[PDB]
Design an enzyme around this catalytic site. Structure first.
Site: not given
Ligand SMILES: CCCCc1nc(Cl)c(C(=O)O)n1Cc1ccc(-c2ccccc2-c2nnn[nH]2)cc1
Ligand SMILES: [N+]
Lengths: 402, 405
Positions: B176, B171-173, B143
């Site tokens: 997702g 950024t990861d979320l 991230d």
């Protein structure tokens, strides 16, 4: 060839970013997005400029591709009639007004569900449909403050900061864009619609996840770290001779790799830095030693020396570097469109790529009321006689360009 | 239960994800009723299991936060017998999710080509750092790195100061959430074609797309972006203001709201000031205006300003910490404090689902599974293995079953 949402009509009353971003991604997936706009003014983003390209603002252009535009005054009973007639032949209804505002205009879920029991009705608000502060309008900066994101974002010994972009709005839009398709799936078996509640507060609090879990379970409060992290050191941005590089080491073996690359092997066996727990405890002295070294070389040199290191590392890019990056261009993120009156325009492209269809060809963002007549005639079967009357009264507006 | 039917009930998800992006996507699908079969390495399992403290018993809070509504089977996918089990699971599952470097699973016999052969219906979603192909596609996703390479860090931070990263891995979320929506798009498409497809989600693409208007300004006007702290380039005043004991966000979206703010701040002389009479003039003269407003904001407590701003109708809100967040009655009202009963760790609380639907309830969740808690159940109930074949796989070490079933 054929997109998954083709044949799905979306009656889109959204404005600004959160709602429009959701419907843009559904348009990318093939949905027929019918954007309802105020005659004269239209979506708020239309007036937010410069920068301007012709008459269209970059704000509006960035998140309204793959949509059609009908300018209708929904505060007028004749406009309400048109919206209800559209809902009866549409699969999804999206709005982001304060709870009860559309209901007071005769366009609430109860009103729409009566004439469209099949419809998926999605409301995007600041805090939800009910609650003590549910009547406040939603704003990304306000939500990120109330939800806790701002408190944990910023320099460790400085003032809080906001994300460069409205990530709370965008996250909420992504929640809704997935939620809408879940509603459709549920509708496919049951044949009935439902109401969906998305809001900025819920989206951002849910995204706190593990950080929030640390408090809900361990009563641990979070803090700002700038670019570093609280439980792993070194892992942050380091100033270089001409910029910044992010480098991290999650364990003793990665730390050894970083130190060798930096020509500082003496740090690996130092009693103060031999473990991660000790590096966190001695983080201030370690980061200062590492920072002094990082600043002696150019970013390009460090990037070369870290090739194949297997550790997390990357440069801090500005807009110029981002769109000169061959990987960015390779992913199709520079989406070009031919606007009918403004010409070629480029915006960030779709984030997801599917193997069975392409989304690289998008309809340009519509002009205000560009498709008013087309929608009334083709979608609702109005005749030339009735349309001219609505145009003469100002209930709807048709742009010069069709 | 009888009446509480969720949309994705009957959908099986073969979940090999680890860390945050992937697990967050499959957790939201589990909330919607999907049967998430989490495949984990025997012994270690998902990487987040070891990321602590904080720890609750043997389970880390990181792992618990994003793995509710899942079952766990511990199988060694590097063992040919384990590859067999994964392929047998894919044949009866609707979705396949992984976040390994591109090509890693293909070398193990579990790539899209391999799985699609025996499961032509499968929705195969891979979450990577930079995408499936490209010059730098072989780098692992992080991230903090993605937000740096994507341009988010450059435009985040105090004006005239160092870059900053979002407090959480947005950024990861975001990636997702992209994936959790993309998977359901694949399911819908399967209704028409009867066939599956491959989905490429990655951190770089997600974050660059989120740049939206900022990127368009450069792609169209060749304009470079800058950091603004908490303020904005096109609207003034709209930022965080230091109070006597904290911070409050206050904004004025038009001249009428600006007048409202000035009256509340006891600064009516600013309303007719030649430098601040319009938004265009306030932006141009932003430096001096913010200093005048900031001076006033610092004289009163946050609690006082919140009281004085009641009913103002302007954008305003306090900067809350975790304690303020979960003491806010609205937060509790939205059901965001989701409590679960863990079989060995006890009652645990994590952030609840963000979306609420009128036709079903998601407030009741299965607790995050223990490592290999459902190994036997899955092999017998999902794949129809008999007690001898399962016992042989356990004895051979191909799979592992936790004490708690
Ligand atoms: C007094 C508040 C003034 C205006 C307003 N009215 C509400 Cl409602 C909101 C809200 O949604 O916060 N805003 C703020 C706001 C304005 C613009 C955008 C936006 C729009 C299109 C494309 C990108 C972005 C963006 N990308 N990054 N940042 N902005 C997004 C949010
Ligand atoms: N918005």
């Amino acid at each position: 060839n054929i997109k998954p949402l083709e044949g799905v009509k979306i009656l889109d009353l959204t404005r600004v970013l959160a709602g429009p971003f959701a419907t843009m991604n559904l348009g990318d997936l093939g949905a027929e997005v019918i954007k309802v706009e105020r005659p004269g003014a239209g979506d708020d983003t239309r007036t937010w400029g410069p920068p301007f390209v012709g008459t269209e603002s970059t704000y509006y252009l960035s998140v309204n591709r793959n949509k059609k535009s009908i300018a209708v005054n929904i505060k007028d009973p004749k406009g309400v009639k048109i919206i209800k007639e559209l809902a009866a032949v549409c699969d999804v209804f999206v709005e982001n007004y304060v709870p009860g505002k559309l209901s007071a205009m005769g366009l609430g879920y109860e009103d729409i569900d009566e004439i469209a029991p099949h419809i998926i009705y999605c409301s995007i608000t600041g805090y939800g449909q009910t609650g003590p502060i549910s009547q406040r309008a939603g704003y990304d900066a306000v939500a990120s403050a109330v939800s806790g994101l701002m408190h944990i974002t910023g320099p460790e010994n400085g003032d809080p900061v906001r994300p460069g972009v409205a990530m709370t709005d965008l996250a909420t839009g992504l929640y809704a864009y997935g939620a809408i398709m879940a509603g459709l799936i549920q509708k496919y078996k049951t044949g009935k619609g439902l109401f969906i509640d998305c809001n900025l507060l819920s989206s951002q609090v849910a995204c706190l996840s593990h950080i929030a879990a640390n408090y809900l379970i361990g009563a641990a409060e979070a803090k700002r770290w700038g670019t570093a992290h609280g439980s792993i050191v070194p892992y942050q941005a380091f100033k270089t001779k001409d910029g910044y590089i992010v480098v991290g080491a999650g364990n003793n073996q990665q730390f050894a790799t970083v130190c060798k690359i930096l020509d500082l092997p003496e740090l690996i066996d130092n009693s103060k830095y031999k473990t991660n727990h000790l590096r966190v405890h001695n983080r201030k002295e370690l980061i200062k030693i590492l920072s002094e070294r990082f600043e002696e070389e150019l970013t390009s040199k460090w990037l070369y020396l870290f090739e194949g290191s297997g550790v997390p590392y990357g440069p801090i890019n500005n807009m110029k570097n981002v769109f000169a990056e061959p990987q960015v261009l390779h992913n199709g993120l520079v989406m070009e469109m031919e606007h009918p009156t403004v010409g070629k325009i480029s915006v960030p492209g779709p984030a997801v790529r599917y193997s069975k269809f392409k989304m690289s060809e998008a309809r340009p963002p519509p002009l205000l009321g560009q498709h008013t007549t087309h929608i009334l005639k083709e979608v609702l079967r109005y005749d030339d006689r009735a349309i001219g009357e609505l145009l003469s009264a100002g209930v709807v507006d048709q742009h010069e360009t069709h």
